[PDB]
């Protein structure tokens, strides 16, 4: 019984050590991977929502058609968005109208990285390959 008592004391201390080491290892592993885990969780939750505006802005961000400021909610407010190629312009921009964030915007001002004003008539398959891409389009919420 004395031998069994010291056996149980030894195995109790073994369980103490196992639990403490597991807690330490898991805590340091979770605190180490806090940025990438949070970003992956955020994009998982974003995909699960499957909102049409969120999916639109994310798909445009993958192509590089990201905004330059916070997308505004008030009507007739200003959105600045960089378009990096004619492909992203052809789908989003129809005439003077700009489809973005599941909303329609009125194109106001197109500039280049030289800040040169470019008319909407100059964006085409032939003249743009000489332009200073990426364009930056400033539009108003309609």
């Amino acid at each position: 019984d004395r031998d069994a008592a010291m056996q149980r004391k030894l195995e109790k201390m073994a369980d103490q050590a196992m639990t403490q080491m597991y807690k330490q290892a898991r805590s340091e592993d979770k605190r180490a991977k806090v940025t990438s885990a949070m970003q992956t969780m955020l994009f998982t939750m974003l995909r699960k929502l499957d909102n049409d505006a969120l999916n639109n802005i994310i798909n445009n961000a993958r192509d590089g058609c990201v905004p330059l400021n916070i997308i505004p909610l008030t009507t007739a407010a200003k959105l600045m968005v960089v378009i990096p190629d004619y492909n992203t312009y052809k789908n989003t921009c129809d005439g003077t109208t700009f489809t973005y964030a599941s909303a329609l915007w009125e194109i106001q001002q197109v500039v280049d990285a030289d800040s040169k004003i470019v008319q909407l008539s100059e964006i085409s398959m032939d003249n743009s390959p000489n332009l200073a891409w990426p364009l930056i389009v400033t539009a108003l919420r309609a």
């Binding site: 030894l10 290892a25 592993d29 590089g64 990096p84 190629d85 000489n130 200073a132 891409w133």
Partner: protein, 590 residues
Amino acid sequence: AVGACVLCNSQTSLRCGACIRRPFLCCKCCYDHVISTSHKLVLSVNPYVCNAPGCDVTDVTQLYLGGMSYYCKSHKPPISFPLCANGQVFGLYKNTCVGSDNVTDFNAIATCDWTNAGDYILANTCTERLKLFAAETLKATEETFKLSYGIATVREVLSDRELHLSWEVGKPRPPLNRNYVFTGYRVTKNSKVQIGEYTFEKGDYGDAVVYRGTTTYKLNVGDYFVLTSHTVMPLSAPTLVPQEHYVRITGLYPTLNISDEFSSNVANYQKVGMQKYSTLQGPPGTGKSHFAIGLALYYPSARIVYTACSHAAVDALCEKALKYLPIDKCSRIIPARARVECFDKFKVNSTLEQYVFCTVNALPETTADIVVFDEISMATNYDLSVVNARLRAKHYVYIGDPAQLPAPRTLLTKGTLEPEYFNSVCRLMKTIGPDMFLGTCRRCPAEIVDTVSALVYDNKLKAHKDKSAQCFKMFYKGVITHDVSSAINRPQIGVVREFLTRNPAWRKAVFISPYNSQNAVASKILGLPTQTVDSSQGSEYDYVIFTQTTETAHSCNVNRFNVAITRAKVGILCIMSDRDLYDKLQFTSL
């Protein structure tokens, strides 16, 4: 303290004690490694020695996990159980460890001393994790080789500008140049403590070293020196980021009439934009490092980090960029000690500038839009992993040629290393081919290129100049003075000195020789700018005097001689030793 097995990336908590780098190993892989090799020490969270009052057993098949600790055969608690058994070695995550078949190459990588040549050709054609582990242990072995260099001491001081040296009897003597430093001792009774950081270089006359120190302490005769050690950090990033072929250029933007000089390489610029990483292989002086600056002029908005393994190559790249790029947006990043004298004409050491030039070793962790690695021959897989870890990027461009001289590889002393095993980039270049290839010499005259298209390149290069007849091949015996453990050829230097006052247009030709000793000692007798062949690569000069110091396997190396001669721009005089080497080239009479 858990980790990931090197050759299977399972979870583990074991490491090999005998290995220099102490790599993590899963249970199956650790059993396969220890039961077959001579390594018999395994470190868990606690080391696997025997926990008797006093006992020293490390072999893992002898031990048991008894009671609450690891105990040997006749010290164990009466309740067992064996550690190294059941085809595994007992550790954490025991029943999730999948082994491999790469425990046949890992044994060779861990065991080998990097003396033969096959160790490098097995350290560069293995799997991707072993490509990193082998580079890590190779750097570790190269560092620990310095621990076998003889302890110095001072004989006396007649002249305080030139120290006297005395090596310990019975040990090898390290070479005397800038790359090696020393730190002292005063072990008499009475201060076994360091006395400063010193460095050495030989003197021409008698036995003397014209030393240098970080402080101004004198050595009472008992004070002495020992070469210190550079601990080698661990590395994680892959040697080459996996390639993806984009349909169209992403993240980069073209320009409006880039220039009238770079109008030929436009297709290669677009190809660079299309692919994740690109490789440019070309014979020397064909437009490789003048391709990178043209690329910068083609992607003006793209932040670019230029890097190289050497200092005298990135300095030439900096000068070229100053000649072409806008000088306001440049930088130059130098290490804290700055052993060599670097380029001070831009705003030095500003990492967040648009165009940033640095060596591989001093790269700071940052981002970019395209990173241009240059002279990949000088770079080992450690440098590739370093540049792939510190510098994030959208596009990678590796420019260089395998036929130039490779990295030093001081440990290698048996056999020769073929180009296709210099590193992963050169292996890619030689296996499937470069992504961009330009063979036409735009720098060197017709004579020297028409001779180098016979030594190294199999009659491939046409070129563009006219042979100015200022290409000279000299016959001179050149008696040997093996002085600094690198040879010095005093009579060849005498030939040069006696026929450098007969050449009024050669008063500024750079002096090139394979041996650093003669290359450094020539500065007194002729006063020309001096340069070793290894660092001359990547830089051009208007006139070159090359001296084959002694006949060996180092100075008669066709790659070294080819990278030496092709730095000339209008003419080069070279004095040769090998009756063959002087005959394979076609130069003037003398």
